[PDB]
Amino acid sequence: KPQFPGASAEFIDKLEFIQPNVISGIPIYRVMDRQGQIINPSEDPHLPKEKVLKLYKSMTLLNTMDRILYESQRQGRISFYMTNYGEEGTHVGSAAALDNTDLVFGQYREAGVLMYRDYPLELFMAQCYGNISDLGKGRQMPVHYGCKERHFVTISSPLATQIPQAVGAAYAAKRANANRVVICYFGEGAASEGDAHAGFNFAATLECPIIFFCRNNGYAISTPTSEQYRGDGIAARGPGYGIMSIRVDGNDVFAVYNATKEARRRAVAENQPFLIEAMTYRIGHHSTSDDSSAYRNYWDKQDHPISRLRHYLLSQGWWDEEQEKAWRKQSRRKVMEAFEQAERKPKPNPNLLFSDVYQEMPAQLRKQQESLARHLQTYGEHYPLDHFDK
């Protein structure tokens, strides 16, 4: 018997390399087919009508908001935007499986999670416009949302940095005896970052109640997954770190829900990490700065998460064309009301450029604030002052 401290294993007396299984990778868990039919009755979560209607309304309200704000960006009314097209199921399926106070760290393409947690349209808008209602004080580019009330840690642009952070928050939760789980969303491109290897390993070694949720949508900007990795996607990495792992059909809200619900239950009971890789497809451009036709649908028309959910509602007798029409109208009205309000609000006082750099304001930073104030007293005609509060 081998005695080495670094592994538990038998000897073998023949030379055999371990080959990766990439052609027959980890299978894709799926609950309902593309016609919204349940495939295996024993896997049906039988979510109640009101909850399934909330999943559906959340994804379509997000879709309505995406369309309007994408247009606002094209017109130059906001500086930037990123849509969620094709990935709305991963957001709502997973958020619905969490407890309200489970802490969320994300990347930027998870706004459905906030929607599901009832983040006001006014606040999505306020952040994108950087107006006086934005609790982020207009400091970050659009879609960098955050909400302390709804336990959604502020998004930042640097990819994957939230992965080891989410692990630390999960370790703290364990110590606090929280009965709380942290979920950490990231894309398959972000998973190539060193911080992903940091986070996965720490969560296993330090026994943290965290779910790592990878949206694998086939592209990182222009880069197809064939140039991103060569193993069997992200799910096949998890067992190597000792992380229980699963791959799901990210266009199936029920598959995403079931996987997330069971991961949450086990992560919190057992203080161990789980990894879920949700297979989907990025229907939109990467962002308003991307024209994706430069490097690449079947997905939009033959396998969309919203369409699939709609078919399911119909089969239960839970939705019809009349309701669909009324909701289309009501959601447009709600988004348009928030949009008009957000455009009319002023931007925050330029003083706010200096606060929160440190908790307190260092005297030398206050000197800089004072220098700006004197500058604007003299040269203010040359600045967009009428747009800014106070």
Binding site: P142, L159, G189, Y229, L372
Partner: protein, 336 residues
């Protein structure tokens, strides 16, 4: 815009700054069969079009995408250069250079010294978009050059225009030291002028006096050179003050002699940069000038820089050291 761009070596064509970078890269691969270009999204031509057409011209083994991992991109580039092959790495925004900070500072910069010149990574260049862009906020606006200026063994180079960019980029690529070449992204489309089709070089560690003057020296780099050029115009018109306008070009090793020679003549110095004041590279220039030109200095040296905060989204117009902030500082320094 907070600035206005204003515009021997054979035939030229009008090129904007992204095109001048492509021209430099195209000339480099044509003449150096070892040269490769790699990084995130460079295969389809890059997110700022700097590599358009190059993979089709030179082949997929020579212009290719990497995984999304900056510490990998730089470590990988160093290893190519260790074999003697030219490695032109891209980092997609300078704001995301930091994951590679250890590979740059502990490895690339020290490779030659610590081996006694048995090994080196001289044939590495790292190019990255840089500087403000109107709405880039915290992570698509940064100017990290002062972080790198404190690291002996690398060169850091920033052009102000398409003509400058191609000449300085070719020099970086061919220089026998690891170089970081920061491309001011606001100029990628905005600045266009005549650029030689065929390769040419502009020397590193050499400032350029773009306008002679006698009353005050103004120093900047990147887009900020255009701001101080306008400031020079404002000062002439409003104050009858003659400004000498200098583009530093190379951050390290920097052209100490050209700056000191100017200040010895004018007696006054103002340095400006988008990066935050504290720890910014203007501190190094101001200290050095004070040390060399003490007897000539008629007024304290002025530094007009970004404030000591992260780079904001909606407050950008109030954050940058624009022409009015530079002008006002100059006015006070002239009155001193």
């Amino acid at each position: 815009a907070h600035f206005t761009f204003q515009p021997e070596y054979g035939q030229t064509q009008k090129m904007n700054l992204f095109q001048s970078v492509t021209s430099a890269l195209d000339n480099s691969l044509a003449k150096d069969p070892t040269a490769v270009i790699f990084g995130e999204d460079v295969a389809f031509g890059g997110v700022f079009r700097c590599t358009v057409g190059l993979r089709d011209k030179y082949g997929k083994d020579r212009v290719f995408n990497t995984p999304l991992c900056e510490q990998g991109i730089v470590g990988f580039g160093i290893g190519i250069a260790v074999t003697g092959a030219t490695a032109i790495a891209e980092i997609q925004f300078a704001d995301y250079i930091f994951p590679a900070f250890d590979q740059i500072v502990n490895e690339a910069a020290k490779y030659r010294y610590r081996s006694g010149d048995l090994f080196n990574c001289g044939s590495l260049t790292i190019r990255s978009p840089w500087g403000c862009v109107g709405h880039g906020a915290l992570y698509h606006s940064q100017s990290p050059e002062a972080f790198f200026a404190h690291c002996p063994g690398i060169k850091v180079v920033i052009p102000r225009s398409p003509f400058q960019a191609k000449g300085l980029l070719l020099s970086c690529i061919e220089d026998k030291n690891p170089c970081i070449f920061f491309e001011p992204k606001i100029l990628y489309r905005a600045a266009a002028e005549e650029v030689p089709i065929e390769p040419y070089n502009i020397p590193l560690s050499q400032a350029e006096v773009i306008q002679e003057g006698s009353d005050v020296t103004l120093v900047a780099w990147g887009t900020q050179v255009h701001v101080i050029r306008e400031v020079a115009s404002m000062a002439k018109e409003k104050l009858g003050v003659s400004c000498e306008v200098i583009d530093l070009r190379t951050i390290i090793p920097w052209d100490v002699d050209t700056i000191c020679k100017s200040v010895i003549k004018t007696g006054r110095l103002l340095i400006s940069h988008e990066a935050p004041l504290t720890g910014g590279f203007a501190s190094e220039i101001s200290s050095t000038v004070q040390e060399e030109c003490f007897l000539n200095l008629e007024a304290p040296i002025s530094r007009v820089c970004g404030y000591d905060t992260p780079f904001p989204h909606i407050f950008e117009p109030f954050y940058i050291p624009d022409k009015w902030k530079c002008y006002d500082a100059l006015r006070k320094m002239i009155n001193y």
